[PDB]
Structure formats: structure tokens, C-alpha cells
Design a protein around this ligand. Structure first.
Ligand SMILES: Nc1ncnc2c1ncn2[C@@H]1O[C@H](COP(=O)(O)OP(=O)(O)CP(=O)(O)O)[C@@H](O)[C@H]1O
Ligand SMILES: Nc1ncnc2c1ncn2[C@@H]1O[C@H](COP(=O)(O)OP(=O)(O)CP(=O)(O)O)[C@@H](O)[C@H]1O
Lengths: 247, 87, 248, 52
């Protein structure tokens, strides 16, 4: 039974539209934590209060070193508080903006940590994990941490068209992430929402010259329209380009 | 803490009429009332669309304690707010 | 392809969460249409602009007599406009509240109309459409019109638990509406999230004393935890209770 | 019709992804167009009404 008085606030780590989050420390134990605040009014106008409460219970049955922990929650008259694990090194999105692209060693390591967490999620019957760069947090040792609490460029055609989908969705997003890490932008990015929508349905993307032959093979196997033709998560971890560059 | 306000409106030798202020939809309010300081507290609920309730069956010359707390549909109950009224 | 000067905006037909829908008569063909005037500032503040724009793309390709048509859209510097098919008799949620419950032949006809629309959606592999009574409009001849743009009572157990799902989720929502049409409330309505989560996951619902055996047999077959045990859409149309009260 | 109508400026508040000119294309961050009918392009809802 947590409350606001049990935490000592710190500097704000971020401030978006739906909410914000500060550094927090439990007063009794002085343990460093993160307190994400969400407004009930904003989540009620967009219908996210349904899926926010659903993901709060979902992520309590999941334990993985590459998935951000949720230790509890509490609320008041106008805000919703989530006690999260502190990620000191920020987001992959912000880090991608500062360096444009990642090397093959860091990219393959990110894919391995992502595929491992998704394999644990699929084993626990968890389906869709939004692995946007904004939702990928970095631990103290630089390890990736999924924090699922815009998204157009990362969803397969079966999701943007309102069709059925399964665990093969994460395989498409891995290929989009692997492309963005090495190139610097999502493969289907365009100026119009209509153009980016059609480019996803047609799988309209090209490889730049500097992309190695091993990276092109992995991305081409993942970015497939038919979900049944995409590989399985353990096939990604056994890929020669992954095992040669990951850690 | 919501309900941020509470008061006894009408009152009656053996009855009470309480009212409260929320800017957020609530499922219902858990109303419980008992004498300050010795007996099990009686409990009853009032729908979240109502802003008042009636407590009857009390006893004259008794200082009661009326605590009210709302319940969020997704996040549970709020912190209660106490009040006193001597019959 | 469209602009504000192509229409003659008339009286409002009801306020929306982000704007207002008006009656619009085109300037050229003089066709009566519905114009949803959604404000940008509230679509950008709530974070639903991409959600509506995505559903606009999906709805623009589904042409069925029981689905409200999206003919096109346009926008200004601070509002978004949507050319919708005109539904004169309002929404089912309003008439479900004007009365308490529906007929047996009105419920079966509505279920038959819904099962036909979802058969057209499942043929294009398009699954999971918000068919709640608030999203159900009435045509000229009382026909059901599916419109798109709390909601936990219509979700199957595989969705509230956070698992993968197929086309059987619309078979679950079909049974929830059939119960609400005959009773007046969803079969898993509760006063909390956990109480609603427990009722849906464990399939805890009861039929009142006025529910026909043929009606409760169809609802019991559709409201099953295991999605593979849910019937086919053609089995719902070939149901004895459906074929004895529908008008298709 | 996105408003203000060879160096031609617009000063359109809007935002705008880019401006195509009847064919060239200027970035949306710029409020002028140096040429040597304008369509304002929004990201989600596409082009605005032309002018003009
Ligand atoms: N455990 C955590 N540890 C460290 N930082 C965290 C964190 N959780 C969230 N953040 C920080 O705040 C940001 C994530 O929260 P945020 O509210 O911004 O995302 P969001 O999903 O709500 C949409 P938006 O980014 O537009 O606000 C991150 O950029 C991060 O810096
Ligand atoms: N094609 C259409 N034809 C006739 N009336 C329509 C209509 N579309 C919407 N409306 C009417 O005007 C109102 C507009 O509300 P809107 O379409 O935004 O639904 P919503 O998703 O916001 C939930 P609610 O309707 O309860 O506000 C509706 O309540 C309806 O009565």
C-alpha cells in the first residue's frame, strides 16, 4: 500500500503530454526509484485508462532482466502514480538522436536483448510489446529495458490494416528497429501518413550502401508481409550476423 | 482527499443527511458511521452518481464519526475523510 | 478533393468528444451527408489523431449496407472534417435507453445484420470492430449501421488478459450485444475493474427469468472462454432462434 | 484556404510538412519560396485547399 508520502522526489527525468516522471527515493530505505505520473483526465479522454490498468497487471507477472519492473502504483484525485525501476542511461530514442546510428556491435546486442525479452513474453502468452525506441530504456550497464506504459513506423501491415495478428508482430518491429539502429531512420518513413501507410503495405524500402550483407539478410527475413514467413525469435538469436556482433 | 468536502445538511433526532463535494467519475462511495471511541462500525454504499446520503437509526446524545471515501473504477479506493456530529 | 465550400452545413446532430457532427448538403449533387467537424486542438491534446486517421483508412475500404460509409475527408488550419453517411434514426444506445430491452425479432434481426457485416469484415481478414450500441447507427429502414472513430464490458477474456486473439473475438462481442439487447445491460457488468475482470475471465453471467431457451442457447454458445469453441458466423445465421425471428 | 498569397512568402501558421508549388517543394520550416498554385501538405490529413 504505497502512497505519495513514502517517496522523496528528485529531478524530473521527463515531461511529455500525458504525464511525466521524476527521480524518486523511498524515504525509509533511500532506494533510488522512478515515479511516473499520469493524469486521469488525459487517459480518460483517449480511452487509455483501460489499457493502462491492463498493462499494470500484465507486467507484474513478467520478470526479465531486459524488461523494466513495475513495483506498484497509487493514485489520488487527479493523478496516477507508477513506481518504476530507474533507468540511469535514458532512452534508446534520445541516444539515437545524438549519434544518428549505432555500430553493428551495439545494434546486434540490442536485438539479442530485445529478442530474449520477447521470447520470454511469448512464452508467458504475452502478444504485442510496443518496442518503440522511446519505450526502450537503458540500464546502468547499458542493457536494454522494455518499458511499455509515432507508433506508425513500427507496426506490420496486419496491425495498421485492422487485421488479425499474433506473436509474429514483434519480428516485424525487430526488423524495423534493426534498420533504424544502423541507418538512422525507419525504413518506411515518408512525408505523409498516407505515404508511410502505403509503403508499409507494399514493404517499400531500400538498403543503403553501407549496410553489411549480414545485416541486409536479417532485415530482409524480418520485413516480410506474410507473418507466417517471418522467422521465430530463436532463429534471430541464432543468426550468423547476430552471434558474430552481439555480446 | 476526495471527497474533499463533507457536512451534515439537515439532521434529525434519530437521522442524518450528509453531503459531500470530485472532478473525476467514481464508482460509488463507501459510507460508514460510528460513535467516536467501542462498537462495530456500520457500513453501506451509495452510488457514485449521488452527492448525498441518509443515515438513520442513531441514538441521541451520542457523538458519531462519519467517514467517507470514494472508489475509483480502475485504481481502487481513495483516502477517507472524517467528520463528527453529536446527536 | 474536398473543401468547406462544397457543402451547406445545417443543424447539429449531436456533440462529440472532440467536436460536433452536423447535417451537410453538398453544393453540387445536393446529397444529404453527415459532416463530422472534429477539432484539431483536442485531437492533438488527447493523442487520438493517429488512432482516428488509422481507422479512417480502414473504414474507407469497407463497403457494406450494414456499415456506415466513409466517403472522404478534408481539413482546415484547426479542424478536421469527415464525410459520413447520414443516419436519420440516431444511435442504438439512445433507443436502448429510450426503452429498456428490445424484442426477440428486433434482437435477432440486429444480430443477423451484425453477423452479415462481420462476415464481410472477416472475409477481408479484418477483425475486431467496435460494435457496441454507441457505435451502432440506424438507417432509414431501421437497418443497423456500424460506425467507427467503459468499453471493457464487450471484450473477450483473451483480450482483457493481454493475449493473442483471432476473429473469434467478434463472436464474443456478438453474444454480449445479444444479451444486452434482451436484458438491457452487458452480462459482465460490475462496479469495479477487478470485479469486471473476474466476471469476464471466468465467464460469470446469469439469464433473467424472461430469456427464451432459444435465446440463452445462442448466447451460451457465443460466450465461451475458449475461442476455438465459439461458433462460426454462418452457424449464428443458421441458428433456429435466429432464423425464426430475423428478417434477412 | 491555407492564407497569404520571384520570392513569395506565406506566413501560414498551420504545421505544414512541405509546400509543393505549381513542380517544386520547399521545407515546412521555411515561410517563403524562391522560384527560379501552392498546396500545403499536412502529415495526417494530406493537402490543404489550393489557391490562385
Ligand atoms: N524508469 C525510468 N527511468 C528513467 N527514466 C524514465 C523512466 N521512465 C520514464 N522515463 C523518462 O521519461 C520518458 C518516458 O516517459 P514519457 O511520459 O515521456 O513517455 P510516454 O509514453 O508517456 C509518450 P511522451 O514521450 O511523448 O511523453 C523517457 O524519455 C525517460 O527519460
Ligand atoms: N452519420 C451520423 N448520422 C447522424 N447522426 C450522427 C452521425 N454520426 C454521429 N451522429 C450523432 O451526433 C453525435 C456525435 O457523437 P460522435 O459521433 O462523436 O460519437 P462518440 O464516439 O464521441 C460517443 P457519443 O456519441 O456518446 O458522444 C452522436 O451522438 C450522434 O447522435
Amino acid at each position: 500500500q504505497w502512497a505519495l508520502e513514502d517517496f522523496e522526489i528528485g529531478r524530473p527525468l521527463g515531461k511529455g503530454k500525458f504525464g511525466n516522471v521524476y527521480l524518486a527515493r523511498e524515504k525509509q530505505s533511500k532506494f533510488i526509484l522512478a515515479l511516473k505520473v499520469l493524469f486521469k483526465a488525459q487517459l480518460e479522454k483517449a480511452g487509455v485508462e483501460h489499457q493502462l490498468r491492463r498493462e499494470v497487471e500484465i507486467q507484474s507477472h513478467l520478470r526479465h532482466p531486459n524488461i523494466l519492473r513495475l513495483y506498484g502504483y497509487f493514485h489520488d484525485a487527479t493523478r496516477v502514480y507508477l513506481i518504476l525501476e530507474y533507468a540511469p542511461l535514458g532512452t534508446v530514442y534520445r541516444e539515437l538522436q545524438k549519434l544518428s546510428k549505432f555500430d553493428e556491435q551495439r545494434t546486434a546486442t540490442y536485438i539479442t536483448e530485445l529478442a530474449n525479452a520477447l521470447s520470454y513474453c511469448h512464452s508467458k502468452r504475452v502478444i504485442h510489446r510496443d518496442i518503440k525506441p522511446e519505450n526502450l530504456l537503458l540500464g546502468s550497464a547499458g542493457e536494454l529495458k522494455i518499458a511499455d506504459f509515432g507508433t506508425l513506423d513500427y507496426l506490420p501491415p496486419e496491425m495498421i490494416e485492422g487485421r488479425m495478428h499474433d506473436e509474429k508482430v514483434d519480428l516485424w518491429s525487430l526488423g524495423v528497429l534493426c534498420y533504424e539502429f544502423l541507418v538512422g531512420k525507419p525504413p518506411f518513413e515518408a512525408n505523409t501518413y498516407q505515404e508511410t501507410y502505403k509503403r508499409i503495405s507494399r514493404v517499400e524500402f531500400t538498403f543503403p550502401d553501407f549496410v553489411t550483407e549480414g545485416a541486409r539478410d536479417l532485415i530482409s527475413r524480418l520485413l516480410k508481409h506474410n507473418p507466417s514467413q517471418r522467422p521465430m525469435l530463436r532463429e534471430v538469436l541464432e543468426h550468423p550476423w547476430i552471434t558474430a556482433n552481439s555480446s | 482527499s476526495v471527497p474533499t468536502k463533507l457536512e451534515v445538511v439537515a439532521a434529525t433526532p434519530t437521522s442524518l443527511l450528509i453531503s459531500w463535494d470530485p472532478a473525476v467519475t467514481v464508482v460509488h462511495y463507501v459510507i460508514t458511521y460510528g460513535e467516536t471511541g467501542n462498537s462495530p462500525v456500520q457500513e453501506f454504499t451509495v452510488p457514485g452518481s449521488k452527492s448525498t446520503a441518509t443515515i438513520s437509526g442513531l441514538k441521541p446524545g451520542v457523538d458519531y464519526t462519519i467517514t467517507v471515501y470514494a472508489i475509483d473504477f480502475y485504481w481502487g479506493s481513495y483516502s477517507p475523510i472524517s467528520i463528527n456530529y453529536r446527536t
